[PDB]
Amino acid sequence: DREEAAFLAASILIQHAHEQGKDDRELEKILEIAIRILEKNGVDREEAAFLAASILIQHAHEQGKDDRELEKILEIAIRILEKNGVDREEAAFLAASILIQHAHEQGKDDRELEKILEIAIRILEKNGVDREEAAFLAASILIQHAHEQGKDDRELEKILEIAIRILEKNGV
């Protein structure tokens, strides 16, 4: 299907560019061209930027990159979302959401999931929201995604406890 065909093409291109190890300027040009082809195939501009950012972040998380290069990838995604008319606060929120949702879907253990949460909080705080609001946003994303995946009461309590640790570590 047209939309999904463009999505797969963009995914191949973005992931291959990232695997090559090319710098962030060439990478940004690749993201621009992916969004242009998504847009040419009838996808909303904001939605095309969102899809490009999710592809980038999900590939970078699958490659197990360290926290510094990962937050650089996140900054790239946020800049692209900004460039396509998304409010910077909403852009950081979307990028953090992408990251945390992918981490929960991977089934990553709690010690590493807390690091992922802390990274999302770092980028939300760096954009210009309070640490309390940023941690609340992170916890919100995690809780909503876990409840939407139909997880059992046990996993729900584990998720809630992780979120509560986050909040009482970052302002409560």
Partner: peptide, 12 residues
């Protein structure tokens, strides 16, 4: 509380 759209899984 902002609703969140479902994530799309990444291709292999």
């Amino acid at each position: 509380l902002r609703p969140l759209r479902p994530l799309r899984p990444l291709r292999p």
